[PDB]
Structures are given as C-alpha cells and as structure tokens.
C-alpha cells in the first residue's frame, strides 16, 4: 500500500459482499456500503465510509464496482433520465430513515401504523425497482413521481417528519433558495396534501365510497365492461340477444344494443 | 443468493438482541396475568410487572383490573431472577396434573407456565392466549439468555432480517456477487503511504 | 375582464399609454366601491404586461402603493387583509424575476412606499389564526429581495432621530414576537430556515445602523441594547444540535445549505458587545444572564469565543470596581447559572473549558482577577455539584436518590450561603416529601426555612419572598403562615410534641405582637386537641436499621 491520489470520481464505492477484514481499517463491509473514498490506489481504495465518514478503509478495486459518478448525475450524464435520479437518492435516504423509525417502532405498540408502514414500504420499494429502469412512458414517470411523493410525505406526516417541496424534478429546485413566495405557496401546497390525506385516512382506510367520489370528480368518461359467460334459456331456435343499458326511470335505453347471437343448441351460434 | 444468504444470516445478532430487548420492554410493561381456578370470587386478573432494572417482578393477587397494570408495590414485588431454575410449560406443570379442585382443563394446556423457585415454590400462571403466552416465555428465556419460543419471534427474525438485507442490496443493483469471493490483489508490504493519512 | 385584454392590447398598442390610461381609470374609482374586485383587477393587471417594466412599473405602481397604504390603516382593513396580502405577494414575486428587467431602484421605491406600512401592519396584524403568515411571507420576501445599500439608503436616513428610534423599537419587538411564538407548523423547516436567514440579514443591517447612529456618537438615548440583545439571544435560542440531529443528514443538509447560523450570530454579538465600550458597565448587571445560555450552547467554537466575554464583563466591573468588586455581577451569574444548569443544559467539557479560559484570562490580570480565580474555583465546584445532581436525577429516578442529591446541593448552598437558591431547593425538597407524604420531614424542611425569618415586622429581604405569592408579607405574617402549615403537617404527621411546642411560640407571638385573640382561641383549641390525642391514642414505634454500604 502506497501511492494514494485524491479524487471525487469514486463517490460510489460499491462493495460486492461482506469484505474480508484484512485491513486494520476494513471489516465485513456491508452490501450497501457506498463509501466516500478519498484516496485511490490502482487495486485498492481508502477513504470515508458511509457508516463512518470520519474513518478510512483500504478496499480492493476488484471489490469496488467503480463508478465515476457523484451525487450529481448530469455533469457526467449518469442520469438514466434527467430529473429523476435526485429522486432515487433522496428516496434511498428516506428508506434509511424509514428503517430507523422502524427500529423505533417494534419496540412500541405502534404495530398498526407499523404494518401500514410495512405495506407503504413494499409499495415504495417496488416502485423504486420498477423505476430503476427508464422504460416507463413520461406519463408513467410523472405519475410515479407524484404518487411516491405523496406516499413519502405521508410517511413524513404521521411520523412528524419535516416537509419537502418542489413536487416535480427531484423535489430540490424549490429548496434551492430560488425565491421566497414560491417557497411559501409550495409549502401550503404541501400542507394541502397533508390535510387531504390525513382527512382521507378515515375516508379510505375505513370506507370505500368517498374515494370513488373523489376519483370520479377528476374524470368524465367511463366504460362498463361486461363479460358474457353462458346463455341459459329454453328457446330451441336462433336467438338474438340485445343487451344494452336502460333507464327504467326515463323509460329508455342508455347504451346501444349489443347484438349477441344464440344458437338453437343451447350454445351461442 | 448463496453469498446473499450467507452474508444475511451471518450478520445475525443485532436483530436477535433487538427482539429480546423488545421482549424485556413487554415484560416490564406486562399486563394483568391469569391465576388458577379463579372462580369463587378470586381475581383472575392481576398484574405482573418487571422492574425497569429487570431484576424484580411486581406481581401478586391483584384485582380484576381491565386497564391492566397499576404501578405500585404489588402483593410481591420480588421474583428472584438470579435463581429461577426454569418455567414449566404444558404437561410439565404440576398444577396441570392436579386431579382435585385445582384441575386445569385441557383448554389451558398452552396457558400453563409455572416459574420455578425455592426448589419447591411454583407460580402456576395462565396466559389469556397463545401469542402473549409465548411472549412471556420469550421474555423469561431472555432473562435466561437463551433461544426464544414464540412463533411470532421467528416471524420477526425472518421478516426484519429480510428487510435489512433488502435495504442493503441497493448498492449492488445491476451488479453480481461472485459466489467465490473476488481474489485479493497483493497488497504491497510497504506502508509508506506516498499520500498522507486521514 | 378589462385586465383580460391587456396582454394582446399591449401587443398592438403603446405600452405606457395603456399604463397611464389604466392608472387614470383606476384612480377614478370612488374610494368605497368594490375594493375586493379592484384589488383582483390590479392583481391580474400586475400579473401580465409587467414582464416588461421600464415603461410601466414606475408608473403603474404609485397608485398601487397609494391604495395599499390606504389599506395600511383606515380601520376598514378587515375584509382586505388577504386581498392586500395577495396583491403584495404577487407583485413582490414579479419583482423577484431577474430576466424581466432591472428594478433595484424600483425596489428602493417599494421599500420607501410600503416598508413602514407593512411593518405597521404586522405589528398590528397580530393574531396567529388568520393568514398573518401571508404577510410574514411578503415582508420576508421584501427583505430578501432587498439590498443592504438599499437598507441604509433611506431607512437609515429618515427624519428626526426620534422617529427612526421608535421605528427601530417597533421593528425589534416585532422581530422578537415573530421569532418567539413562530408562525409556522415547524414542519416547514426550509421556510423557517429561510426566515432565519432573512432575519439575520436584517438584524445585521440594524446592527450597523446602531453602530453608526446610536454608539457613543449618540451620547445618550442608548437604552435599546437591552431590547436588541434580547432579540438576538432569543433568535439564538432554537435550531440546535439535537434538532439538527434527527436525521444524520439533517446536520449535514442544513450545514451544506446554510451552515451554522449560531456561529455568525454569536460572533456578531461578541464583536458588537466589544464595541459597546464605555457603556458596558452601565449595561452589565441586567444583561449578564442573557449571555450564559448562549455560552451554554452545545457547540464548541462560539462557546470558545463567548466565555471570554464573562472575563470582559468582570474586567469592565474592575474598571468600575472603585466602589467594590464584581459581587453584583457574580451574584446574578451564579443565580442564572443555577437555573440553567438545573434546567439540563451544560456539559462537563463546558465546565472544564470555563475553568481553563477564565483562569488563563485572570492570570494575565491582577489581584481582582485572582479573587475572580478563586470565585471561578467556587463556580467549578458548583458546576460539578450540579452535574452530579442532574446525572443522578436522570439516572436512578428513585425519589430517595433525588432527596439525597437535593440535600447535597442544599448543604453546599448553606456552605456557600447563597440563601435564595437555598430556599428554592428547600421548597423542591418539600415538594418531594409531600409527594412521599413524609409530613414529618416536610415540616422539618419548612421549619428550616421559617427558621430564617424573624418575628420582626419589616420584611427585610424579598429573597424569602418566594414565588408562591409575592407582595408585602411582613416577616411576621409569612412566619405565621409557615407555622400554621407546619402545625397542620405535624398534626397529620401524627407527632404532636413539636406541634404543641410550636403552638406555644405562635400563641406567644399572637398575644404579644398581633393581639388577635381569635387566633389565640383557635390555636389553643388545636393545642387541647393535641394533648387529647397524645394521652388518648397510641402510636407505633418505628424500627431503625443500620445500613452498611461497602
């Protein structure tokens, strides 16, 4: 070991498995041990670890999955798609704090919210995994962004965690001291989300029709799907089935007749 | 997932000790426990609280309290933790083998647990149902410092261990772990770091 | 709907002609017609066509200012609170735009024409439940967009010094009543932090204005520093290590984004305190305490910078020590130190650093600093006492240990004769015993207090005047109330010998000094009951055990 050279192109010090403890400064390094390496050797890397950002560890290059990227994913264009990667790092930190409060949870009879946190967690991790790829359509991108933001802020709200802003594009632009009043209105937008979902906890988590009313107040077109299975009738001849929506109060049909032909054998023709 | 499983179960103890300290908290907060044959105006409910020092047990013939534990000097605030031989669970309970007026029916077969102490005194107690019964047994073996006997405890073990390992595999995304560990590059024996330390 | 056209109308018309025409039409509105509607109108107006400003901003605004200043206080501002806030918010936002055009001088005009107005508003607009937060947002936005050169431009250059003084007073009290009793859900942490930054900027500016218009050059009217430092300290009394700690990034997040505010705040206050110069002595005893807690801040550095101010204060007294020494200083020092440490603030390293710094400082200085050295030794003894007390209190939580340590500190104070805090801990212990219903011990404690008093009529020291009730209370009367309570305790304490004993002295005092024979009668009635109890009933004998701690 010698010849160390400072660089920042090694932010993503990625292990492979629990590292051997060969170094006096290394251990069974965890899988997620993304370490801020300060000094780089060809076969080895010593620098700050996520677990202890004040303590070094010399770590094999073969063990490091080298990644030139940094916390910024656009300067080196590491983005799978721009305006999304900040979201993944923030949600990773968010899952970290989820784990911490989780630790704090089991030791307490907060089990109800604990399991609802479990299912929040499963939803969020699967969304994370599915957005690991950039395959989604831009509408899917935006919808994922919005809903995961809603869920993470929900986790924040019942847990008494602070709020974030800048709904889109990483939730970072607004906290970047761009303005003052836009900061305000963003904060109240978030508080509106808070109030929406807290009042609707007792609406959806208990009942199931207020959610339908709220969702249907947003869209106008709907389609009734009908899947015919079998006609049970004693006719013995060719039969035409004109099934359509009807208004008994208005004494008229509401949808066009869907002609279904039924054979004389008991089977549709 | 062979290296994955090896690494996973190999960093075990933290989850175990977390479970055990949770059991400790549960014992301390405790509840009103169930006596034997509390029919003829006998308090079936009575609290058994562990000390915050977890060295004495606050229990006794307490009243039918639906609120649960009341913090005070129970009828006996000491259970000698340092000398408990064991707790008998099931048929090992001598009170279950009773064939007189203290006949415990077969429906409390899994609520029979008696603390062994004084080599002749026993505490034939009853749990309201299985999960807390296993919880109290787990808490006792935690005082005993051995393995657990709650199915829910194994549940917690597997689920939380899975959660933790799952939240570690984020760095190794789009990456593979050679089941054979990667070969160690030869570290030059010289420690004369050309660059400074820290 | 007239606003709805202005965009393309501009696109096919002279801009300023439109500006003046709309201005004329609006000012032509009688002053009591559709205020809500007109404010909405000008809102839509300032929305568009203000992306260009050089020709219209300067001319459209004046009317806007006029109606908003009428909205300042015409006693009919109740319906238009939110409307005015909306107007101001939107226009300020528009101003913040950079690509739209240069507005620095226009910002100056907006300062000149609405700043005092809105400050007056918020100072009046004082109830939290309404949308006061909107006004707060508006004014902080103003201050953020504002410039320091702009700050001193006119706000420093007002009319006669009394006007600017009163303005400054109002500004400071408003800042305090904002920082104190904040306006946000405490979840808008980013917003809180931003508010802190803008408040920092503003109070900085007002610090330089104090230096340049209220230092010795203002030979008198130099009181404010009380209010000013109060505001500063209060602002220095939140957003602390633990809050920073809740997430590990939380420290890192705020530090990267903002750093340690408290660092700069304390450094600023330190240097300006040094700048106070001659008036330090005329300003020490009141403001002594207000600097301990900031010194007690959990960080390291500004603490390092702050303890020396204690030595500066004692030295300033040394300059005034022609009449005595820093006794008046150290008394308040010890007192406030006591409440704070028992409050659970300091740390061991804190006391170590205190000893180190103050001893080092006093070595450089003379005999009076040697007395200060021995008093700092006293201080460190106090500190270790208090740390021991608090650590045991938080550790065992067994009432017995609590009594043990509180007696320890009581003995130490008795040794140090600082009697007021002594009484305070006496009452603490009394509370404890009442919790344990140890009526005997409670009576002994309360007596030990009452022992201090005299049957004299003058209340000689309000130190004995405790916080239970505080007015004249001749020493006699307080002693009488104490004896009444103690006798009651002993009665329900089932130990009547001392009860009768004390009844004797109380009756003596009644007969010889107050002559209220009614109290005599009631008291002797009680004493007869006592004797009856003693002869009649029997009392169990308590066993006494010896305990060997090894």
Short mmCIF file of N, CA and C in Angstrom, two decimals, chain C residues 303-416:
data_model
loop_
_atom_site.label_atom_id
_atom_site.label_comp_id
_atom_site.label_asym_id
_atom_site.label_seq_id
_atom_site.Cartn_x
_atom_site.Cartn_y
_atom_site.Cartn_z
N UNK C 303 -18.79 29.04 21.71
CA UNK C 303 -18.53 28.94 23.14
C UNK C 303 -17.11 29.41 23.45
N UNK C 304 -16.13 28.84 22.74
CA UNK C 304 -14.74 29.27 22.91
C UNK C 304 -14.63 30.78 22.81
N UNK C 305 -15.36 31.36 21.88
CA UNK C 305 -15.36 32.80 21.67
C UNK C 305 -16.17 33.55 22.72
N UNK C 306 -17.04 32.86 23.45
CA UNK C 306 -18.04 33.52 24.28
C UNK C 306 -17.67 33.59 25.75
N UNK C 307 -17.13 32.52 26.32
CA UNK C 307 -16.66 32.60 27.71
C UNK C 307 -15.77 33.82 27.96
N UNK C 308 -14.83 34.16 27.09
CA UNK C 308 -14.04 35.38 27.33
C UNK C 308 -14.89 36.60 27.63
N UNK C 309 -16.13 36.64 27.15
CA UNK C 309 -16.98 37.79 27.44
C UNK C 309 -17.29 37.88 28.92
N UNK C 310 -17.36 36.75 29.61
CA UNK C 310 -17.54 36.79 31.06
C UNK C 310 -16.37 37.52 31.71
N UNK C 311 -15.15 37.19 31.28
CA UNK C 311 -13.98 37.88 31.79
C UNK C 311 -13.99 39.35 31.39
N UNK C 312 -14.47 39.64 30.19
CA UNK C 312 -14.62 41.03 29.78
C UNK C 312 -15.56 41.76 30.72
N UNK C 313 -16.65 41.10 31.10
CA UNK C 313 -17.64 41.70 31.99
C UNK C 313 -17.07 41.95 33.37
N UNK C 314 -16.37 40.96 33.94
CA UNK C 314 -15.77 41.18 35.24
C UNK C 314 -14.70 42.26 35.17
N UNK C 315 -13.96 42.34 34.07
CA UNK C 315 -12.99 43.40 33.92
C UNK C 315 -13.66 44.76 33.82
N UNK C 316 -14.75 44.86 33.06
CA UNK C 316 -15.49 46.10 32.99
C UNK C 316 -15.92 46.54 34.38
N UNK C 317 -16.38 45.59 35.19
CA UNK C 317 -16.64 45.91 36.58
C UNK C 317 -15.36 46.37 37.28
N UNK C 318 -14.23 45.72 37.01
CA UNK C 318 -12.97 46.12 37.62
C UNK C 318 -12.68 47.58 37.34
N UNK C 319 -13.02 48.05 36.14
CA UNK C 319 -12.92 49.47 35.84
C UNK C 319 -13.84 50.27 36.75
N UNK C 320 -15.05 49.76 36.98
CA UNK C 320 -15.97 50.38 37.91
C UNK C 320 -15.75 49.92 39.34
N UNK C 321 -14.80 49.01 39.57
CA UNK C 321 -14.54 48.46 40.90
C UNK C 321 -14.02 49.46 41.86
N UNK C 322 -13.97 50.75 41.52
CA UNK C 322 -13.67 51.75 42.53
C UNK C 322 -14.59 51.64 43.72
N UNK C 323 -15.85 51.28 43.48
CA UNK C 323 -16.82 51.00 44.54
C UNK C 323 -17.10 49.50 44.55
N UNK C 324 -16.26 48.76 45.26
CA UNK C 324 -16.46 47.34 45.44
C UNK C 324 -15.80 46.51 44.36
N UNK C 325 -16.42 45.37 44.09
CA UNK C 325 -15.95 44.47 43.05
C UNK C 325 -17.17 43.90 42.34
N UNK C 326 -16.96 42.82 41.60
CA UNK C 326 -17.96 42.27 40.70
C UNK C 326 -18.95 41.39 41.44
N UNK C 327 -19.12 41.66 42.74
CA UNK C 327 -20.11 40.93 43.51
C UNK C 327 -21.48 40.99 42.85
N UNK C 328 -21.92 42.19 42.47
CA UNK C 328 -23.22 42.31 41.82
C UNK C 328 -23.26 41.52 40.52
N UNK C 329 -22.13 41.45 39.81
CA UNK C 329 -22.02 40.56 38.67
C UNK C 329 -22.18 39.11 39.08
N UNK C 330 -21.26 38.61 39.90
CA UNK C 330 -21.19 37.18 40.16
C UNK C 330 -22.46 36.66 40.81
N UNK C 331 -23.19 37.50 41.55
CA UNK C 331 -24.43 37.04 42.15
C UNK C 331 -25.42 36.61 41.08
N UNK C 332 -25.69 37.50 40.13
CA UNK C 332 -26.59 37.17 39.04
C UNK C 332 -26.01 36.04 38.21
N UNK C 333 -24.70 36.05 38.02
CA UNK C 333 -24.04 34.96 37.32
C UNK C 333 -24.40 33.63 37.94
N UNK C 334 -24.20 33.51 39.25
CA UNK C 334 -24.44 32.26 39.94
C UNK C 334 -25.90 31.89 39.85
N UNK C 335 -26.77 32.86 40.08
CA UNK C 335 -28.20 32.59 40.05
C UNK C 335 -28.60 31.99 38.71
N UNK C 336 -28.41 32.76 37.64
CA UNK C 336 -28.83 32.31 36.33
C UNK C 336 -28.14 31.02 35.95
N UNK C 337 -26.85 30.91 36.26
CA UNK C 337 -26.14 29.67 36.06
C UNK C 337 -26.88 28.52 36.71
N UNK C 338 -27.38 28.74 37.92
CA UNK C 338 -28.08 27.69 38.62
C UNK C 338 -29.33 27.28 37.87
N UNK C 339 -30.19 28.25 37.54
CA UNK C 339 -31.43 27.84 36.89
C UNK C 339 -31.13 27.13 35.59
N UNK C 340 -30.09 27.56 34.89
CA UNK C 340 -29.83 26.98 33.59
C UNK C 340 -29.30 25.57 33.72
N UNK C 341 -28.33 25.36 34.60
CA UNK C 341 -27.74 24.04 34.71
C UNK C 341 -28.77 23.06 35.24
N UNK C 342 -29.51 23.44 36.28
CA UNK C 342 -30.59 22.57 36.72
C UNK C 342 -31.62 22.37 35.63
N UNK C 343 -31.75 23.33 34.71
CA UNK C 343 -32.59 23.12 33.56
C UNK C 343 -32.12 22.01 32.66
N UNK C 344 -30.88 21.56 32.81
CA UNK C 344 -30.38 20.48 32.00
C UNK C 344 -29.81 20.96 30.69
N UNK C 345 -28.84 21.87 30.76
CA UNK C 345 -28.24 22.45 29.57
C UNK C 345 -26.79 22.06 29.35
N UNK C 346 -25.92 22.31 30.32
CA UNK C 346 -24.49 22.32 30.09
C UNK C 346 -23.89 20.94 29.91
N UNK C 347 -22.57 20.89 30.09
CA UNK C 347 -21.82 19.66 29.94
C UNK C 347 -20.54 19.77 30.75
N UNK C 348 -19.90 18.62 30.96
CA UNK C 348 -18.68 18.60 31.74
C UNK C 348 -17.59 19.41 31.06
N UNK C 349 -17.37 19.12 29.78
CA UNK C 349 -16.39 19.85 28.99
C UNK C 349 -16.64 21.34 29.07
N UNK C 350 -17.91 21.73 29.19
CA UNK C 350 -18.23 23.13 29.37
C UNK C 350 -17.55 23.67 30.62
N UNK C 351 -17.70 22.98 31.75
CA UNK C 351 -17.10 23.48 32.98
C UNK C 351 -15.58 23.46 32.88
N UNK C 352 -15.04 22.43 32.24
CA UNK C 352 -13.59 22.36 32.07
C UNK C 352 -13.10 23.57 31.30
N UNK C 353 -13.78 23.88 30.21
CA UNK C 353 -13.40 25.00 29.37
C UNK C 353 -13.55 26.30 30.13
N UNK C 354 -14.62 26.43 30.91
CA UNK C 354 -14.80 27.62 31.73
C UNK C 354 -13.62 27.82 32.66
N UNK C 355 -13.26 26.78 33.40
CA UNK C 355 -12.13 26.89 34.30
C UNK C 355 -10.88 27.29 33.54
N UNK C 356 -10.60 26.58 32.45
CA UNK C 356 -9.41 26.85 31.66
C UNK C 356 -9.36 28.31 31.22
N UNK C 357 -10.40 28.75 30.52
CA UNK C 357 -10.39 30.08 29.94
C UNK C 357 -10.33 31.15 31.01
N UNK C 358 -11.17 31.05 32.03
CA UNK C 358 -11.23 32.13 33.00
C UNK C 358 -9.94 32.20 33.81
N UNK C 359 -9.40 31.04 34.21
CA UNK C 359 -8.13 31.06 34.93
C UNK C 359 -7.03 31.64 34.06
N UNK C 360 -6.96 31.22 32.80
CA UNK C 360 -5.97 31.76 31.89
C UNK C 360 -6.11 33.27 31.77
N UNK C 361 -7.34 33.75 31.63
CA UNK C 361 -7.58 35.18 31.49
C UNK C 361 -7.13 35.92 32.73
N UNK C 362 -7.44 35.37 33.90
CA UNK C 362 -7.16 36.06 35.15
C UNK C 362 -5.68 36.04 35.48
N UNK C 363 -4.95 35.03 35.00
CA UNK C 363 -3.51 35.02 35.19
C UNK C 363 -2.89 36.27 34.58
N UNK C 364 -3.34 36.64 33.38
CA UNK C 364 -2.88 37.86 32.75
C UNK C 364 -3.19 39.09 33.60
N UNK C 365 -4.19 39.01 34.45
CA UNK C 365 -4.64 40.18 35.17
C UNK C 365 -4.29 40.09 36.66
N UNK C 366 -4.72 41.10 37.40
CA UNK C 366 -4.17 41.45 38.70
C UNK C 366 -4.95 40.78 39.83
N UNK C 367 -4.74 41.30 41.05
CA UNK C 367 -5.36 40.81 42.27
C UNK C 367 -6.85 40.53 42.12
N UNK C 368 -7.60 41.47 41.53
CA UNK C 368 -9.03 41.26 41.42
C UNK C 368 -9.33 40.05 40.55
N UNK C 369 -8.48 39.81 39.55
CA UNK C 369 -8.63 38.59 38.77
C UNK C 369 -8.19 37.36 39.55
N UNK C 370 -7.36 37.52 40.58
CA UNK C 370 -7.08 36.39 41.46
C UNK C 370 -8.30 36.05 42.32
N UNK C 371 -8.97 37.07 42.84
CA UNK C 371 -10.24 36.84 43.51
C UNK C 371 -11.22 36.18 42.56
N UNK C 372 -11.27 36.65 41.32
CA UNK C 372 -12.09 36.00 40.32
C UNK C 372 -11.69 34.56 40.08
N UNK C 373 -10.39 34.27 40.16
CA UNK C 373 -9.92 32.89 40.04
C UNK C 373 -10.50 32.02 41.14
N UNK C 374 -10.43 32.50 42.38
CA UNK C 374 -10.95 31.69 43.47
C UNK C 374 -12.46 31.55 43.36
N UNK C 375 -13.12 32.60 42.87
CA UNK C 375 -14.56 32.52 42.66
C UNK C 375 -14.90 31.59 41.51
N UNK C 376 -14.01 31.48 40.53
CA UNK C 376 -14.22 30.53 39.45
C UNK C 376 -14.01 29.11 39.95
N UNK C 377 -13.08 28.93 40.87
CA UNK C 377 -12.98 27.66 41.58
C UNK C 377 -14.30 27.33 42.25
N UNK C 378 -14.85 28.31 42.95
CA UNK C 378 -16.19 28.19 43.51
C UNK C 378 -17.19 27.78 42.44
N UNK C 379 -17.11 28.44 41.28
CA UNK C 379 -18.04 28.18 40.20
C UNK C 379 -17.93 26.74 39.74
N UNK C 380 -16.71 26.27 39.54
CA UNK C 380 -16.49 24.91 39.09
C UNK C 380 -17.01 23.91 40.11
N UNK C 381 -16.81 24.20 41.39
CA UNK C 381 -17.39 23.35 42.41
C UNK C 381 -18.90 23.28 42.25
N UNK C 382 -19.53 24.44 42.07
CA UNK C 382 -20.96 24.47 41.80
C UNK C 382 -21.30 23.59 40.61
N UNK C 383 -20.55 23.74 39.53
CA UNK C 383 -20.87 23.02 38.31
C UNK C 383 -20.79 21.53 38.52
N UNK C 384 -19.72 21.06 39.14
CA UNK C 384 -19.62 19.62 39.36
C UNK C 384 -20.75 19.14 40.25
N UNK C 385 -21.11 19.94 41.26
CA UNK C 385 -22.25 19.59 42.09
C UNK C 385 -23.48 19.39 41.24
N UNK C 386 -23.77 20.36 40.39
CA UNK C 386 -24.99 20.33 39.61
C UNK C 386 -24.99 19.17 38.63
N UNK C 387 -23.86 18.92 37.99
CA UNK C 387 -23.78 17.79 37.08
C UNK C 387 -24.03 16.49 37.81
N UNK C 388 -23.44 16.34 38.98
CA UNK C 388 -23.69 15.14 39.77
C UNK C 388 -25.17 15.02 40.06
N UNK C 389 -25.78 16.12 40.49
CA UNK C 389 -27.19 16.11 40.82
C UNK C 389 -28.01 15.65 39.63
N UNK C 390 -27.81 16.29 38.48
CA UNK C 390 -28.66 16.02 37.33
C UNK C 390 -28.42 14.61 36.81
N UNK C 391 -27.17 14.16 36.81
CA UNK C 391 -26.92 12.82 36.31
C UNK C 391 -27.59 11.79 37.20
N UNK C 392 -27.56 11.98 38.51
CA UNK C 392 -28.24 11.03 39.37
C UNK C 392 -29.74 11.12 39.17
N UNK C 393 -30.25 12.33 39.00
CA UNK C 393 -31.69 12.53 38.84
C UNK C 393 -32.19 11.81 37.60
N UNK C 394 -31.47 11.96 36.50
CA UNK C 394 -31.83 11.29 35.26
C UNK C 394 -31.50 9.81 35.30
N UNK C 395 -30.61 9.38 36.19
CA UNK C 395 -30.16 8.00 36.21
C UNK C 395 -31.08 7.10 37.02
N UNK C 396 -31.28 7.42 38.29
CA UNK C 396 -31.98 6.48 39.16
C UNK C 396 -33.48 6.73 39.22
N UNK C 397 -33.89 8.00 39.22
CA UNK C 397 -35.31 8.37 39.28
C UNK C 397 -36.01 7.77 40.49
N UNK C 398 -35.24 7.34 41.48
CA UNK C 398 -35.78 6.84 42.73
C UNK C 398 -35.82 8.00 43.70
N UNK C 399 -37.02 8.31 44.19
CA UNK C 399 -37.22 9.51 45.00
C UNK C 399 -36.16 9.64 46.07
N UNK C 400 -35.70 8.52 46.60
CA UNK C 400 -34.71 8.53 47.66
C UNK C 400 -33.42 9.18 47.18
N UNK C 401 -32.94 8.77 46.01
CA UNK C 401 -31.74 9.38 45.46
C UNK C 401 -31.97 10.85 45.20
N UNK C 402 -33.17 11.20 44.76
CA UNK C 402 -33.49 12.59 44.48
C UNK C 402 -33.37 13.42 45.74
N UNK C 403 -33.94 12.92 46.83
CA UNK C 403 -33.78 13.61 48.10
C UNK C 403 -32.32 13.67 48.50
N UNK C 404 -31.59 12.59 48.29
CA UNK C 404 -30.18 12.58 48.66
C UNK C 404 -29.44 13.72 47.97
N UNK C 405 -29.57 13.80 46.66
CA UNK C 405 -28.81 14.79 45.92
C UNK C 405 -29.32 16.19 46.22
N UNK C 406 -30.63 16.36 46.37
CA UNK C 406 -31.10 17.70 46.66
C UNK C 406 -30.63 18.16 48.02
N UNK C 407 -30.55 17.25 48.98
CA UNK C 407 -29.96 17.62 50.25
C UNK C 407 -28.50 17.97 50.06
N UNK C 408 -27.81 17.22 49.21
CA UNK C 408 -26.41 17.52 48.94
C UNK C 408 -26.25 18.96 48.48
N UNK C 409 -27.03 19.35 47.48
CA UNK C 409 -26.89 20.70 46.95
C UNK C 409 -27.33 21.71 48.00
N UNK C 410 -28.34 21.38 48.80
CA UNK C 410 -28.75 22.31 49.84
C UNK C 410 -27.62 22.54 50.83
N UNK C 411 -26.94 21.47 51.21
CA UNK C 411 -25.81 21.62 52.12
C UNK C 411 -24.73 22.47 51.48
N UNK C 412 -24.48 22.25 50.19
CA UNK C 412 -23.46 23.03 49.52
C UNK C 412 -23.82 24.51 49.52
N UNK C 413 -25.09 24.82 49.31
CA UNK C 413 -25.51 26.21 49.26
C UNK C 413 -25.42 26.84 50.64
N UNK C 414 -25.89 26.12 51.65
CA UNK C 414 -25.71 26.55 53.03
C UNK C 414 -24.26 26.87 53.30
N UNK C 415 -23.36 26.02 52.81
CA UNK C 415 -21.94 26.32 52.89
C UNK C 415 -21.63 27.61 52.16
N UNK C 416 -22.22 27.81 50.99
CA UNK C 416 -21.95 28.99 50.19
C UNK C 416 -22.86 30.14 50.52
#
